[PDB]
Design a protein around this ligand. Structure first.
Ligand SMILES: [Zn+2]
Length: 273
């Protein structure tokens, strides 16, 4: 089956150099594998995001030559799907309602103890937690090798729907990547630790687990003007050939050659650069 990858930005700001790295690396790996590359706007909580940011992000991708396949998926148009997934989990004996306060959880060290797991509380003024069976605590990264996660965090009956009504990231990412047919997730190293919880969720749904690559995080908005020197800097960051005389080429030519020359093994394995 065809490779399917994606870039899934949060519209809490515009793209910066760090998010360009994630977009570019996901794009290059997808195109090198003769695959599809999709874009999903994570506008799951629009009251806490910035009007106009999603549109800015899509325009920036186009400016840097990173054109996606198909239609953009919007998480603001997917709450029906998340609700459906929650209903299935509850019906299948895989979730429960938790009425514990923030203060209680804080007092026991910040990781839930499964207090409400067999209390059979109703949905009224409650969070929804997953009822883990066999938590995943390690995974394979195609760049970094085998990763060992924080065991206490990995084994928690984690929140999948918040008491304030927000759908949890870990729920929505699995439901949407599955819906879009994603076969490999190429993203930043800041998402390493939640990976094992997401894999646990794929297993509870009975769904095929994708492959994972976590790129190094670039640490301290993209220029509106000439994108070429910024693209060259991003290619260098990712350990790729970085054309000296970029002034003689278009963005499109630079990307076409970067796809031809893409070497995953040359990407740095540091968590942060
Ligand atoms: Zn509870």
């Amino acid at each position: 089956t065809q490779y399917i990858g994606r870039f899934a930005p949060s519209p809490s700001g515009e793209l910066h150099f760090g998010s360009l790295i994630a977009a570019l690396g996901s794009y290059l790996q997808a195109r090198a594998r003769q695959g599809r590359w999709l874009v999903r706007i994570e506008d799951i909580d629009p009251p806490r995001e910035v009007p106009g940011a999603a549109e800015t992000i899509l325009r920036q991708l186009e400016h840097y030559g990173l054109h996606w396949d198909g239609d953009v998926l919007w998480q603001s148009q997917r709450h029906d799907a998340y609700r459906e997934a929650l209903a299935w989990l509850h019906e299948q004996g895989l979730s429960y309602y938790c009425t514990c306060t923030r203060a209680r959880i804080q007092s026991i060290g910040g990781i839930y103890d499964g207090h409400c797991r067999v209390l059979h509380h109703g949905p009224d003024n409650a969070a929804v937690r997953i009822r883990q069976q066999h938590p995943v605590t390690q995974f394979t990264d195609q760049l970094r090798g085998i990763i060992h996660a924080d065991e206490k965090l990995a084994r928690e009956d984690f929140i999948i729907h918040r008491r304030d009504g927000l759908f949890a990231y870990n729920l929505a990412v699995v439901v949407d990547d599955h819906f879009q047919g994603v076969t490999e997730i190429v993203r930043g190293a800041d998402l390493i630790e939640p990976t094992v919880r997401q894999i646990s969720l794929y297993q509870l749904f009975g769904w095929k687990v994708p492959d994972y690559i976590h790129l190094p995080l670039a640490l301290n908005a993209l220029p509106k003007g000439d994108p070429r020197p910024v693209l060259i800097a991003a290619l260098q960051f990712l350990g790729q050939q970085a054309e000296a005389h970029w002034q003689d080429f278009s963005v499109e030519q630079i990307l076409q050659s970067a796809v031809k020359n893409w070497r995953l093994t040359a990407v740095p394995e540091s968590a942060i650069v």
